[PDB]
Structure formats: C-alpha cells, structure tokens
Design a binder for these strands. Structure first.
Ligand SMILES: Nc1ncnc2c1ncn2[C@@H]1O[C@H](CSCC[C@H](N)C(=O)O)[C@@H](O)[C@H]1O
Ligand SMILES: [K+]
Ligand SMILES: [Mg+2]
Ligand SMILES: [Mg+2]
Ligand SMILES: [Mg+2]
Ligand SMILES: [Mg+2]
Ligand SMILES: [Mg+2]
Ligand SMILES: [Mg+2]
Ligand SMILES: [Mg+2]
Lengths: 191, 208, 86, 323, 137
RNA sequence: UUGUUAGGACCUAAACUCAAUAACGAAAGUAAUUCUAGUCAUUUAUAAUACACGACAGCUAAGACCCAAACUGGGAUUAGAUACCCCACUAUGCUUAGCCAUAAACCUAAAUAAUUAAUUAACAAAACUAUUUGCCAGAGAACUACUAGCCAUAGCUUAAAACUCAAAGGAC
C-alpha cells in the first residue's frame, strides 16, 4: 500500500544502474566516456575493497600475511581495466613498510586466485600494491631532516598612489597658476 | 632540436671501448650491438676523452659564463685552481712535518669536497595557499642538491666581495673556507636546513 | 554500567603487536555498526531526514547488489574469442 | 559643545597615575586630554595635533597645568621628529591616545569647510596656515579625473556609486569652479534623481544626505589621514613603554581596520577578496600576537548617548598593551 | 593451543600472567579521545590514580591541542610518570573517537609500557539524550 | 572545572542493534519489555447543515526538567551581519485536565468492480471501461474584503468584486 522505497527507487535507478545486456570493452582481459562505465567501475572498486579486505585480515592468503593484518587505504581499478592499484595503509615505520610491501606483492597472484575461486569476482585482472606518494614524501622529509645538520648552536597600502595623485593635483595647480521568407517572390513569379 | 628523437647521446669513455669483450656486462654488451644500427649525436665541442676533464668543474665554469664568454670563464676557473694550489703550497712549506701531512694541495680535490660541504639535503618550494605564500619543506633530488651548491658559491663571490678583489681571489678563498666548513656558503646551507625544521609541519600542502 | 567490565569490545594483544590488535578492534566496531552510530550521534538527525537516508541507502544497496550480479553473470562469457576472423 | 566621547572608557583603560608619561597624538579641542589631567593632577602628558588652531588651544591650556601637558604641532608622521626634538622626555610612554576624526571646533566652524550642512569655503583641511601649499578639497575635486576622483570616493568614502558621482563633479567643475561646500553637495546630489538626496537611512535609523560619503572621502584624502595614521600607530608602538596601554577610537571602518589589524598582528597590506569563494572556513601566520588586548571587545557608544553626539556613533574603542 | 582474542573470562582461572599478575590485576590506561583534547589517565586495579596527561598539559594550544602528534606526546608523558610509579603492563580502555585515539596508544608504547589488551568504551546510548542540532555550513 | 570509580542516588527524558523488515491503524500516527482490555460478519459504491477524530507549533491551570532549544545576552565574522559558526540561558518539547483544528495533513493516485486487446502528447505511476459522489472553468488581485459559524480575539473554516494583463501555467 505505502512503500518507503518507492520514493527513491527511480532516482537510484539512473545513478546506480544501467539497462541492457552489454558489458564494457574494458572489462575484458584484453574512447568515448560512458555513464555505464562509471557504474561498472564503481561497483568493482567496492567489491574488490570488500573482497580484498576478506583476504588480508583472513587466513586464506598465508600465515605471515594473516599476521600482517593489512588494512587498506583504498582500491582503484584502471579505466582500461588492464590492472588494479590496491593502495594499502602505511605505518610510520619506513623499514617495516618496505618489508610489508614485498610480502604483499609476492602473494598478489594467490590473492587474486582466492577471489576468483570463491566466485565473488569472476574475471579479476592483475593486482598491484602501492604506497601513497603523500605518505612516502612525508617520511622522506623526516629522514632527511634528521640527517640534516643545523650548524653550530603607505600609498600602496590604501591602494591609491597618494604621491602620484598629489603630483597630478600639484601639476594641475601649476597650470592653474522575417519578411523576405514569405511567399511573395514565389507567388509573383520572380524565379 | 635538429636531432631527431632517434639519436643517441655519444659515449666518450676511452677505456670502455677498449675493454676486453668478456669484461663487459651483457647489458652493456647488448647496448653496443644495438647502437651499431642507430644514429649517434655528434660530440660537443667541449666533450673530449681528456684525462683532465672533470664534469663537475666544467659545469661550474658554464654557470659563471656571461654572454657566451667561455674563454673568460675558463680563464677565471684556471686562475682559481692555481690560486688554491699556490695558497696551499705556501701553507705546506711554512708548516711542520706533522702539519704537512694533513695539508691538501690538490685543487681538484679541494673543489669537489668543498661543493659537497655546501649541498643541502632539503630545500623549500614557495606555495600560495588561500592567498598566502608558504614555503614547504621538500626533499631535494641529486640534481637540485648539486645545482644549489654551485649557485650559492657563484653568487657569494659575484656580489659579496670588495670592489677591487677579483673572482680568482674570492672564489679561491671561498672554496678553501667551504673545504673547512667555515664559509658563508656553508652558512646559507645551515639556514636553509634550520628553516625546514621551522616549517616541518607544513609539508602536507605538497601536491606534486 | 551494571554489566561486567573488560568483556565487551575487548581485544587481546598477541606478541606485543599493539597495532594489529587496534586494527582488529576497529574492524569489530565498524562491522557491528558502532562507528557509524557514534558518527551520526554527534548531531541530531531529524526523523524525516533519517527516513529519507535509510530509504535511499536501501535502494542503493539493492541496485548495487543487483549490478554485481549482472556483471558476474555476464563475465562468464568473457573469454578468448573462439571465432576470431569471423 | 562636544563632550569627549567614550572618554570614561579611555580614562579607566589608561589609568593615569602619578609618575607616568602619556602622549596624545590628536589633541584637537583637548577634551580627552583634559579628562586625563583631571583624574591625576600629577600625571605627565604630551599633546600633538595637525591643526595650528588646536596647538594654540593646547598652549592656552598649558597655563592650567604648566608642565603636566606639553603641546606640539604636526602630523602623525612628524610626531616622531617632534618628540625626538623634545628628547627622551616622553621616552617610555605609558599610554598613547590616538583618537581619530575631525575636531569639534574644526567641523563646527563653517569657515573650515568640513561641514556640508553649512556654507563655507571647501577647505576641508585640518592643517591651517602651517602649510599653505597643502591642496584643499577644492583643488582635489577640480583637478582629479574621474578615475582618480572616483577612487577617492570608493576607497576612502566607501562610496557605492563612484562612477556616477565622480562624473557629475567633473562636469560641474567645467561649468563653474567648485569652491563651496554646499555647491559640492548639490553636485553630488545631482548625479541621482531628486528622490535620493536625503534617502540613505543609516543604522541609527536616522536619514542622512547623499553626499556624506564624498565629504568623508575628501576629508581623508586632503589630509591623507589613513596613510598618516599607519605611521602614527607604528610610531606609538616604538614610543610606547613595554606594558604600556594604547587606546584608540575609530569612527569609520577604514581607520578601524588599520587599528583592528595592527593590534592583532594583521597587516593593512593584506589583499582583498570580493564576495566570491571567500575562505572564511576551509571546508598559518608568520608570528603570534604582539599585544595583550585589555578590551579586544569593541562597542559603539550607547544609542541614547549617540543622539547627543551623532558624530561619534561609530566610535570603536580598541585597547591594547605592548608586548 | 592458540591465542585467544577474547579476554580471560573474569572469575575463572587462566594460565596467562604478565609479570606475575593476572589479567584482573594489570593497571588500566583510560584514554578519552575527543575531537579537541586527548586526555590520558592510568590507574591501578583498585582504582588509584598513578599518571595523568593530556595535549593541554603538555603545552599545546587551540587547534594544535587536537592533533595526532599532540596525543603522542601526551602518551609518552603519561608513560614516563607511570613508569616511575612502577608500571610495566597496562590495559588500554580507549573511550572516544577523536584524532588522538590511536596516537595516544602509540605514545604509551613508545614510553616503555606494554599494552596487553585494548578495550573500547565509547558511549553508545540505547535510544538517551537528544544531540545538539546539525551545524549549517 | 577535568579524568577514573566492578561507589551511592535518581527513575527525568528518550527507546541502539534487530530494521537489508514493510506490519498495524480511518487518517493522524504507531516498533524497549510484560500483563489486562481490544480490532471481526452491514452485498458493494455513494454524506452534511450531524457525530467522533486529527502531526508540529500555540493558548489555559498545576507539575516535571536529563538533554535539546525560538527569544535574549555574550564572543567571532563582515563595508554592515538584527544571520550562517562559538558559548550561556529561557518560552517550548514531558505529565495531568481543556482548548486550538492547521501541514508539501502529498502515493501531489476519490472509492468500487472489470479487462489486458480488439492502447505511446510528454514526463511520472502501462492503458482503459463502468457506477456514485465531490470538485474545476484564463492569470493576478486573493490562504484578501464583506457575511455567517466557532472555547478560536494578531485565529480557523466559508469566500467575492472592482481593477490590471494577453497571457499565466505544464512537459521536453
Ligand atoms: N594625521 C594626523 N596627525 C595629527 N593630528 C591629526 C591627524 N588627523 C587628524 N588629526 C587631528 O586629531 C583630532 C581628531 S578629532 C578631535 C579629538 C581630540 N581628542 C579633541 O578632544 O578634540 C583633530 O584635532 C584632527 O585635526
Ligand atoms: K509527498
Ligand atoms: Mg549576538
Ligand atoms: Mg526550560
Ligand atoms: Mg486545509
Ligand atoms: Mg504524513
Ligand atoms: Mg492558512
Ligand atoms: Mg482570512
Ligand atoms: Mg472574514
């Protein structure tokens, strides 16, 4: 009789859904921007964010990776869908991050297998693990700072050039001291 | 440029070409075979196989040249090196046997260790955020770190010297003072680093 | 207040990995919805506002879950071309 | 008569006491200076003004207190030299009172040209015969082009209608010289229809003339009060004792901004946004504050009192201690 | 034969000790992480105050008082006072969801204290007091 | 003041998760738990000048008071800021009696029984037949003037004309 979902069913149907049995060219393993592509890539980034967190903090990948307990900063797939860029949260310790980077990357192939096997995502492209460049720079600006040595222990204000205006005044003081488209032509015979 | 992108920079290392074939890494061995089917840029007028050619000093010469006067700029560098060699020989002869050991009389080695003492690890980039100019601590590359040391030297001598002193006499007196970590060019490095600590928390504004 | 302390929302640190334990506690609170609940209790959401948000989030979850099904369903046919050249 | 407005707040803020040296950079009629010398008869005070008439008033009033008040004549910029000629006797000044605006005597007297309501020559110059070559408002209106003249109205008078008002002056001066205050008022009131002559109601809920902004603009430009004020506050800080209390009264926003920005470490140089994407919030500073603001909180006089002195309605009292 | 995330059940007998004390005896580090100030207090298992700190007491002011690095300094300060009093193991009950929620726990670790567990006690009313009105921006 | 209390009091106020549910009721509205009372048969549609209801705000008297909060005061911002932001605190939101009778009270869908083909103005929510009542007749003037009724008195319901215009309005 009264359905709360009716209010927003038609609005969310153009924002979060497209019609027709068409899959994108990118989504294949091997142009003009479309709205369906934005939907087809937004949902994958959410599924992979949900599904790639069910591997890092779960025991399937490995015992060391399970112990790593890697939370993820964000997941973002390329528009071409050639590969993925799984950003991961990066602790302050640079050395540990370097080791964690290598560990995750080695299991990238197996992690993909785990998702593809479970059937959450049928055709997942190769995965990558990247460190946020912002985080790396902030760490580097701290490393170099520690290494670094600090050594041994009026008219223009208001906006009117009062001086120039005074000269202009003193200088002045020195001087002081729809019709042709009708059928008329056709109906007369002027051809 | 009149060179097409397919041209390769020339390799002017005399020993590299005459090395025995087995002494070359296969990566280097592969490049040599590839280069046989490529175009090579002509060598620069100042690019030679001379054993006395130092890239760092040649670069420092070009940063002093004004209006393409290479003869004058090279003469100024030649006079400087000599003024440094003559200044250390005087000290060496007028020093005890124990002190004589420490004294360094190589001008080429005083120049390189001088510049390296002036190089700064971190620099600053000027940024206008919300209509206010802020300079954020940046980590300097190997190229930016080297350029700043040479630029700071050529600017202390050009400007902050007496009117009748000459560049071979101010530059020689500064390479040696930087060589001992006492000069004003070193003081510029210390100020740059000290300011970075002041703006330590303002690096977040970086977007590049 | 009348319950027992240190049973609810408590995690134990393993081998002095205090960061790993904190990361686990956050996933527990986020999964149970406490994080979202505490976020929205800072200010007051009006009853009409609350209903509009819940109806939109429900419809967004339906269309998202349905779009996942359609991609997964249509991704089975995603394979090397068998009739290359025709 | 014009009672010194908000003098009680100044007197309490200054707390004039024996053995303290004070300065007044705007003696004028001397009402404020006399109030400081009444609370404490043993206080030491120095007076200054740009008007030779005002200086004579101080010299005449120096008989009342032979050494407690010291009279001086000159601008804010020339104040440092005048106090330097005296020597180090001002030295560590406990308080500098920088009241602003036109003197009660200056604007009450029609001959001085400050009053548009009365008919007098268009002098509008606080300086008297001390400098006879200082251009008057008559020279300013008759000499400057629309571009220059409009900027004076827009920048110093906050004139909303700057191009129309400026053009009327340029046309009127060509027809006849603009030499009288009422002549200029009619010229400004002629750029618009007759309805707008007396229409611009104020926050007071009292109507005002349409050329009040032109007289304020010319008053500040002829005497360059704003630029000279920038140097007066800077010289007061130099001559202000550490722990000394500064007290200023700002009757319009332009002077208030310089006093408001100065006492909070902000700079008048700061560029201006123009009602597009202003970052009041972001959805920092070179150095910290250099003052202990006894009364950062500002207020106008009481509305009942304002009726008695409408000229002082917008008086904002800004008090600070040197750091 | 595995580690249990679940705290030793109170009232029973367990095989886990820390410096010869049971779980019920380890001192507690109460961290209140708000959006402006992060306070920290350490108490004994009998509810006796041992250390106290906060971004404000360390000397931060205004918006600096509510940063991650400000809470880290406050945690290091609380650790040092507690370490002097004779504390090596702490149970971290972290109330609040502010910026220095984690940083305060990191400072305590940097200060030489060994956290054995982390509890969360952020107040969650079950229906309670009407929150203040939404801010318009 | 603050933090902790596996200390005491309070029973004011409001009912997380469940709820990704779509139930109950004429509508308004209603979801912490328990118990008591309780919804039900007129063939069906069709009612006002009658009767009984009717969110929130508001009024009347006596209480309550954790938190929220018109107004007001204080602080910022601004050319100004009677605002947006910060802080404090009222009317008020609560209970018990009575009044008030208004909502974008909107599924912007009167009810009921059929049909899905011999049917695209557009958009929304596919089209369409029959029955009964209500309502509409260019826009503004006009949720207005006057009239009558009303616990309503700066109120509600009922509701014009002069005069002005050649458009107003809906969808794409
Ligand atoms: N730049 C400047 N330098 C010096 N005096 C100035 C000045 N600008 C304005 N004045 C003077 O300062 C006074 C401000 S109005 C008068 C206030 C004075 N305290 C009194 O009791 O009368 C006037 O006398 C005015 O001529
Ligand atoms: K509706
Ligand atoms: Mg206010
Ligand atoms: Mg109340
Ligand atoms: Mg109605
Ligand atoms: Mg409703
Ligand atoms: Mg109405
Ligand atoms: Mg009516
Ligand atoms: Mg009526």
């Amino acid at each position: 009789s009264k359905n709360l979902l009716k209010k927003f069913a038609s609005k969310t149907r153009k924002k979060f859904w497209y019609e027709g049995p068409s899959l994108g060219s990118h989504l294949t393993p091997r142009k003009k921007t479309r709205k369906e592509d934005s939907i087809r890539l937004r949902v994958l980034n959410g599924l992979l964010y949900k599904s790639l967190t069910e591997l890092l903090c779960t025991p399937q990948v490995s015992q060391e990776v399970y112990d790593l307990n890697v939370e993820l900063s964000k997941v973002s797939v390329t528009s071409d869908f050639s590969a993925c860029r799984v950003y991961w949260k990066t602790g302050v310790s640079a050395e540990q991050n370097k080791h964690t980077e290598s560990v995750l990357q080695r299991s990238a192939a197996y992690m993909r297998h785990l998702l593809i096997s479970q059937q959450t995502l049928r055709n997942v492209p190769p995965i990558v693990f990247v460190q946020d460049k912002r985080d790396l720079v902030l760490a580097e600006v701290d490393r170099l700072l520690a290494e670094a040595d600090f050594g041994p222990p009026h008219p223009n204000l208001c906006g009117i050039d009062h001086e120039a205006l005074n000269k202009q005044i003193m200088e002045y003081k020195r001087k002081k001291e729809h019709r042709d488209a009708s059928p008329r032509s056709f109906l007369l015979g002027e051809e | 440029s009149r060179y097409a992108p397919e041209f390769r920079e020339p390799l002017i290392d005399k020993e590299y070409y005459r090395k025995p074939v087995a002494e070359l890494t296969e990566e280097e061995k592969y490049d040599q075979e590839l280069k046989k089917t490529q175009f090579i840029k002509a060598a620069a007028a100042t690019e030679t196989s001379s054993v006395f050619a130092d890239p760092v000093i040649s670069k420092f010469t070009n940063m002093m040249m004004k209006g393409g006067n290479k003869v004058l700029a090279r003469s100024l560098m030649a006079q400087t090196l000599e003024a440094v060699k003559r200044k250390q020989f005087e000290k060496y002869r007028a020093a005890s046997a124990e002190e004589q050991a420490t004294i360094e009389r190589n001008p080429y080695r005083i120049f390189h260790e001088a510049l390296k003492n002036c190089e700064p690890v971190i620099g600053l980039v000027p940024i206008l955020k919300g209509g206010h100019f802020y300079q954020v601590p940046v980590p300097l590359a190997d190229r930016r770190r080297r350029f700043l040391a040479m630029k700071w030297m050529i600017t202390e001598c050009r400007e902050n010297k007496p009117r009748r002193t000459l560049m071979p006499e101010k530059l020689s007196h500064e390479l040696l003072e930087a060589f001992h970590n006492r000069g004003p060019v070193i003081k510029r490095k210390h100020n740059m680093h000290k300011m970075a600590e002041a703006n330590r928390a303002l690096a977040h504004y970086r977007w590049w | 207040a009348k319950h027992l302390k240190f049973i609810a929302r408590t995690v134990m640190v393993q081998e002095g990995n205090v960061e790993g334990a904190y990361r686990t506690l956050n996933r527990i609170l986020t999964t149970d919805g406490l994080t979202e609940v505490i976020s929205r209790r800072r200010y007051y959401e009006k009853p009409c506002r609350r209903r509009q948000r819940e109806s939109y989030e429900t419809c967004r979850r339906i269309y998202n879950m349905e779009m996942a099904r359609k991609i997964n369903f249509l991704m089975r046919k995603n394979r090397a071309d068998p009739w290359l050249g025709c | 008569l014009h009672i010194p407005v908000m003098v009680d707040q100044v007197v309490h803020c200054l707390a004039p006491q024996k053995g303290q040296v004070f300065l007044d950079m705007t003696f004028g009629s001397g009402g404020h200076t006399r109030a400081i010398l009444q609370k404490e008869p043993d206080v030491m005070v120095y007076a200054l003004d740009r008007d030779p008439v005002a200086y004579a008033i101080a010299e005449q009033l120096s008989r009342l207190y032979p050494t407690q008040i010291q009279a001086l004549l000159g601008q804010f910029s020339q104040a440092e030299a005048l106090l330097m000629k005296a020597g180090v006797q001002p030295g560590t000044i406990d308080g500098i009172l920088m009241d602003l605006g036109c003197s009660s005597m200056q604007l009450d007297a029609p001959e001085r040209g400050f009053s548009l309501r009365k008919d007098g020559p268009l002098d509008m110059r606080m300086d008297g015969d001390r400098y006879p070559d200082t251009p008057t408002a008559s020279d300013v209106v008759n000499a400057l082009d629309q571009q220059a003249l409009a900027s004076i109205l827009r920048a110093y008078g906050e004139e909303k209608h700057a191009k129309k008002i400026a053009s009327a002056i340029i046309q009127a001066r060509s027809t006849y010289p603009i030499s009288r205050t009422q002549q200029l008022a009619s010229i400004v009131a002629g750029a618009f229809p007759p309805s707008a002559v007396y229409a611009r109601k104020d926050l007071l809920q009292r109507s005002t003339h349409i050329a009040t902004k032109t007289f304020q603009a010319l008053r500040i430009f002829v005497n360059n009060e704003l630029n000279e004020l920038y140097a007066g506050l800077r010289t007061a800080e130099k001559f202000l004792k550490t722990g000394g209390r500064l007290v200023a009264l700002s009757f319009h926003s332009l002077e208030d901004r310089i006093v408001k920005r100065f006492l909070l470490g902000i700079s008048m140089t700061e560029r201006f946004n123009l009602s597009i994407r202003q970052k009041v919030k972001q959805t920092s500073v070179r150095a910290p504050l250099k003052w202990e603001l006894i009364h950062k909180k500002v207020l106008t006089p009481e509305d009942q009192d304002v009726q008695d002195n409408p000229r002082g309605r917008s008086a904002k009292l800004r008090a600070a201690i040197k750091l | 034969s595995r580690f249990s995330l679940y705290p030793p059940v109170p009232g029973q007998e367990s095989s886990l000790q820390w410096a010869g004390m049971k779980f019920e005896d380890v001192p507690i580090a109460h961290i209140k992480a708000t959006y402006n100030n992060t306070q920290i207090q350490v108490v004994s298992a009998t509810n006796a105050s041992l250390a106290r700190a906060s971004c404000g007491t360390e000397g931060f002011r205004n918006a600096k008082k509510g940063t991650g690095i400000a809470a880290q300094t406050a945690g290091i300060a609380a650790a040092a006072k507690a370490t002097g009093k004779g504390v090596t193991h702490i149970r971290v009950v972290v109330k609040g969801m502010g910026p220095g929620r984690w940083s305060a726990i990191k400072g305590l670790t940097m200060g030489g204290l060994e956290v054995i567990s982390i509890t969360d006690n952020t107040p969650v009313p079950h229906x309670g007091c009407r929150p203040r009105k939404a801010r318009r921006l």
